[PDB]
């Protein structure tokens, strides 16, 4: 039994098992990074993951992973950060694996397009970085 | 223990080492260990100083898909000295002379024109029905599945009609039987049937142990099974090998009497000379295969031999080979 | 805001593609393109299929970075090796032929 | 004694060995029964075969791990072609007549020809004629020419790694190793062979190298600089290295005392050679006086790379007509590479070879090609039996035939324990590996 505060102050209770998952928890609450919503959002993957630990069971936690992961790139981009901060490794390497298929894309334009990335090659550099790769093209 | 006392004990050999080669060259996920085919397979090379009266030499007929063929002569007689390159394109002296377009075994698979067991065969064809043989080197499944043979029978065919040192001086023409060894035999059947939709006019076709299949499973499959160098299992790989993606056995490729074939009713063909072999697994599809010829109206003679499994012709060492080889010779010079 | 991604977090993302899809977005930008040259990324894909060989990782791995690296071993050699097979696995020899070949080029550009 | 009915088919099995050939076949077809398709995979892809004409060693392998001939190919061409071959064939004939003067009118006809031909044969005749016009008068770049035959054609990259799994099989289970290369050139068949130590199971072993080069005031310190560079490359893989450099005329002009060998049990020795033993067969004697000191540095393996051919006939007309059909074929594989300098430079290359077979005489001529079954007569009454070549050599062949030739129709064949590199059905070189015979 420990009570995690976030951004938003709300002291989040969950059990000292369950929040033995984060390794940066364990070995340390004001939280100042992690945005309420998202520490919800990790509270719910560690209770899940906790249940589980406590196949057909391994494919049903892997489509709910599937149903949860199914949020907007903003929250992925949080999700990303808070998993990086709090030293979790299911949850970064399930949005890790979320965006490598997004970015399983076409041609560059469609990468730079999809996440805004602008990109300022010097058209010496462009052109020599095209032929580098050719073997892909 | 029961192919021991049906063939001699040097064709148990061979047939036997080539059936233990070939299990080892199967991968149960449809792909052929190419290399090491290759490397096991027993090869020689084209000789133009004539050896017991024959001489070879190599063609490259087509360069875009490599297609390539032996050519086996009878030694000039007239002459002496060896030939020399110009004298290998020379004009064939005789009223009548029969050239015969062969096609190798091997169940569209193994095997090459250079292989050292059909140059044999070539080379005593030419000896024993006086008369000169193209060894078409075509290719094979799985890399080429289909209709890459096909093709190359119908290149080689319309080269072998072109050459005028290979005409006859009765009527300015070419006369062309086409002869096929096991999926030979299919080979010829088919191009055969390419040749009478076309203007080609070949006026023979010699098939030996022709490889044909279906879906159900005839009575020669289930009571031979493994019994003489042959199993089911193997058939069935090999027609998967061979055949298009999301085709059944009762393709016309597989069962030339299928009902998606065609028929061969007011169809000119040339007369047929079907050896069926015995205590073979796949018995039954042959004999059907001639009866659909005889009821078709066409001409076909039937050689079924009771005792003779696979590669009987391979060794001149049994009386099948003899009897076949003197109706080969008499089907030709007729 | 991934566009604005730093090397750590895109090193994680591009830990889980495969050759076609890195030396893809190598091209996207010139962060991206510095991540890209990692040569932990190249050794796990030209890994990846290989799945037979031992030696010993250490070894392999101080061996192909003195003569060029991995990406070089992908670009040059294994790439047109897979081109024909894709399905197919490296297994022994395909590795001792692409090493000679990188041992060979080596000793070529170093006069 | 064999049995001609199956030796005939390409199989050397005794009389007297046919029942135990079959006993065995018996028992392997109930072990691949029993293993199934694990097995089966470790057969195939787990093992390497050696000489599959020979089946009681094959199958013995198999039950010990589960438990004068002329060959012509003629490719579409023209009449002028047989045009051109006729006035060949009459000018090496009046030559040879001691017309000496159809012999001009002929090579001026044989140019005439020439122009209005096409082909690769338009490139065969105008340096047949040029070393047929001055041989008439006889009786009245170099570094960069064989580099540019290394990116173009196949022959020098298939001698050098097929010649290096001989040496790798060999040097397994050794401390210390020595490698003499009598064709050291540029010693590009080296790096790849270091390499493979490095990786080799249980440590690399201490590697020297010596090199024999041919005279020049550059190339006694070439061959230093050679060394120069593979010492560095020895270092950044940690491979001990040492190096020392040869000069000398020809190979007859060797012995086994200024080689500074130690003993044989100590560091493993292995000789090579490449495209060297044919330009030797010019000088009286020398071939035998080279083969006797192999055989007094006692190697444990010696590979030997050469051109499949008989360009060493007594009779002038004779090595003519076989050396304008070796080298129409070599013309017509390069016929559909794609032009470039390396391309240019290597028919200058294969030009000298042309001119140098016909025009001289004596020891000036040093293409004395002469075909394995000639040169395996000269290897066997020296003492050296053979060592046989694996499918793991043959694979690395194939792969190498599809990196850089991709449409070009070459193909590998095994033949007597060796290994053949071929246009189609038409043999070019041949690669052999011998050890002394015990
Ligand atoms: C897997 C095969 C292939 C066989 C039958 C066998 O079951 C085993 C023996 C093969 C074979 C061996 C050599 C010849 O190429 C062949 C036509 C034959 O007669 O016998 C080959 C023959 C065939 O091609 O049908």
């Not at chain 4, 199934?36 to 995979?41: C, F, H, R």
């Not at chain 4, 009598?182 to 590009?188: E, H, I, R, T, V």
């Not at chain 4, 043999?427 to 015990?438: F, V």
Request: proline share 4%; aromatic share 8%.
């Amino acid at each position: 039994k420990i009570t995690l505060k976030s951004s938003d102050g709300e002291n989040f209770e969950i059990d000292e098992a369950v929040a033995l998952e984060s390794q940066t928890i364990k070995h340390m609450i004001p939280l100042p990074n992690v945005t309420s919503k998202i520490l919800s959002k990790v509270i719910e993957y560690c209770k899940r993951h906790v249940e589980a630990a406590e196949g057909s069971s391994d494919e049903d936690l892997k489509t709910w992973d599937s149903e949860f992961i199914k949020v907007d790139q903003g929250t992925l981009f949080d999700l990303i950060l808070a998993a990086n901060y709090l030293n979790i490794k299911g949850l970064l390497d399930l949005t890790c694996q979320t965006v490598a298929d997004m970015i399983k894309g076409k041609t560059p334009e469609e990468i730079r397009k999809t996440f805004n990335i602008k990109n300022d090659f010097t058209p010496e550099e462009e052109e020599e970085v095209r032929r580098e790769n050719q073997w892909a093209f | 223990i029961e192919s021991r006392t049906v063939v001699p004990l040097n064709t148990w050999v061979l047939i036997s080492n080539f059936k233990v080669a070939y299990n080892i060259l199967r991968r149960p996920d449809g792909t052929f260990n190419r290399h090491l085919a290759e490397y096991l397979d027993r090869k020689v090379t084209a000789n133009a100083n004539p050896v017991d009266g024959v001489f070879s030499f190599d063609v490259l007929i087509d360069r875009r898909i490599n297609l390539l063929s032996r050519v086996y002569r009878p030694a000039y007689a007239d002459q002496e000295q060896p030939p020399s390159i110009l004298d290998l394109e020379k004009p064939v002296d005789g009223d009548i002379v029969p050239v015969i377009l062969f096609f190798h075994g091997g169940s569209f698979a193994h095997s090459s024109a250079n292989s050292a067991i059909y140059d044999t065969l070539c080379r005593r064809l030419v000896g024993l029905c006086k008369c000169v043989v193209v060894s078409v080197n075509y290719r094979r499944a799985p890399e080429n599945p289909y209709p890459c043979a096909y093709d190359d029978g119908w290149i080689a065919l319309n080269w072998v009609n072109s050459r005028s040192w290979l005409k006859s001086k009765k009527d300015s023409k070419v006369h062309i039987f086409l002869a096929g060894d096991s999926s030979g035999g299919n080979i010829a059947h088919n191009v055969a049937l390419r040749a009478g939709e076309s203007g080609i006019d070949v006026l023979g076709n010699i098939l030996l142990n022709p490889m044909f299949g279906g879906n159900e499973r005839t009575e020669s499959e289930k009571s031979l099974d493994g019994k003489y160098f042959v199993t089911v299992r193997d058939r069935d790989w090999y027609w998967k090998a061979f055949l298009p993606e999301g085709e059944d056995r009762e393709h016309p490729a597989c069962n030339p009497f299928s009902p998606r074939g065609k028929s061969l009713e007011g169809v000119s063909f040339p007369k047929s000379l079907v050896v069926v072999a015995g205590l073979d697994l796949i018995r039954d599809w042959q004999l059907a295969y001639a009866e659909g010829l005889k009821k078709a109206g066409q001409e076909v003679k039937l050689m079924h031999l009771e005792k003779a499994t696979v590669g009987f012709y391979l060794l001149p060492n049994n009386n099948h080979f003899h009897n076949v080889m003197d109706e080969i010779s008499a089907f030709v010079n007729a | 805001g991934f566009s604005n991604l730093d090397e750590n977090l895109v090193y994680e993302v591009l830990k889980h593609v495969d050759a076609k899809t890195l030396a893809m977005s190598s091209c996207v930008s010139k962060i991206w393109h510095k991540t890209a040259q990692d040569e932990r990324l190249w050794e796990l894909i030209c890994t990846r299929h290989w799945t037979n060989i031992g030696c010993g990782q250490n070894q392999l791995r101080s061996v192909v970075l003195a003569l060029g690296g991995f990406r070089r071993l992908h670009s040059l050699y294994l790439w047109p090796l897979s081109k024909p097979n894709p399905r197919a696995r490296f297994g022994k020899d395909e590795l001792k032929l692409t090493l000679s070949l990188l041992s060979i080029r080596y000793y070529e550009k170093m006069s | 004694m064999d049995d001609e009915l199956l030796a005939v088919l390409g199989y050397k099995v005794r009389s007297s060995e046919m029942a135990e050939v079959a006993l065995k076949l018996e028992q392997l077809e109930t072990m691949m029964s029993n293993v199934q398709e694990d097995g089966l995979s470790h057969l195939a892809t787990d093992t390497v075969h050696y000489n599959p004409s020979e089946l009681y060693s094959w199958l013995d392998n198999m039950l010990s791990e589960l438990n004068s001939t002329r060959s012509v190919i003629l490719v579409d061409s023209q009449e002028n072609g047989v045009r051109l071959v006729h006035a060949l064939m009459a000018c090496a004939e009046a030559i040879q007549q001691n017309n000496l003067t159809l012999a001009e009118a002929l090579v001026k006809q044989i140019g005439c020809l020439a122009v209005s031909q096409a082909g690769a044969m338009r490139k065969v005749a105008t340096y047949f004629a040029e070393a047929l016009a001055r041989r008439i008068y006889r009786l009245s770049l170099s570094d960069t020419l064989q580099m540019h035959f290394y990116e173009t054609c196949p022959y020098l990259k298939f001698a050098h790694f097929t010649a290096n799994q001989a040496i790798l099989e060999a040097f397994e289970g050794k401390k210390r190793v020595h490698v003499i290369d009598f064709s050291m050139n540029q010693g590009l068949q080296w790096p790849a062979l270091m390499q493979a130590l490095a990786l080799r199971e249980g440590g690399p072993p201490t590697f020297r190298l010596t090199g024999i080069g041919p005279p020049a005031p550059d190339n006694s310190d070439h061959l230093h600089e050679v060394g120069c560079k593979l010492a560095q490359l020895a270092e950044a893989i940690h491979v001990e290295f040492e190096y020392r450099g040869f000069v000398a005329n020809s190979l007859a002009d060797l012995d086994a005392s200024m080689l500074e060998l130690r003993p044989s049990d100590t560091e493993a020795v292995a000789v090579n050679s490449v495209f060297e033993l044919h330009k030797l067969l010019g000088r009286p004697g020398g071939i035998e006086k080279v083969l006797g000191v192999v055989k007094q540095i006692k190697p444990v393996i010696f590979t030997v790379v050469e051109q499949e051919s008989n360009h060493n006939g007594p009779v002038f007309l004779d090595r003519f007509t076989e050396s304008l059909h070796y080298y129409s074929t070599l013309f017509d594989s390069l016929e559909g590479v794609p032009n470039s300098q390396d391309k240019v430079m290597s028919e200058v290359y294969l030009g000298k070879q042309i001119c140098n077979l016909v025009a001289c005489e004596g020891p000036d001529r040093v293409e004395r090609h002469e075909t394995l079954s000639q040169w395996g007569n000269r290897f066997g009454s020296s003492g050296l039996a053979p060592a046989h070549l694996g499918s793991n050599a043959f694979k690395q062949a194939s792969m190498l035939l599809s990196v850089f030739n991709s449409g070009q129709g070459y193909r590998v064949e095994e033949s007597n324990g060796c290994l053949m590199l071929g246009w189609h059905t038409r043999p070019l070189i041949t690669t052999s590996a011998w050890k002394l015979s015990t």
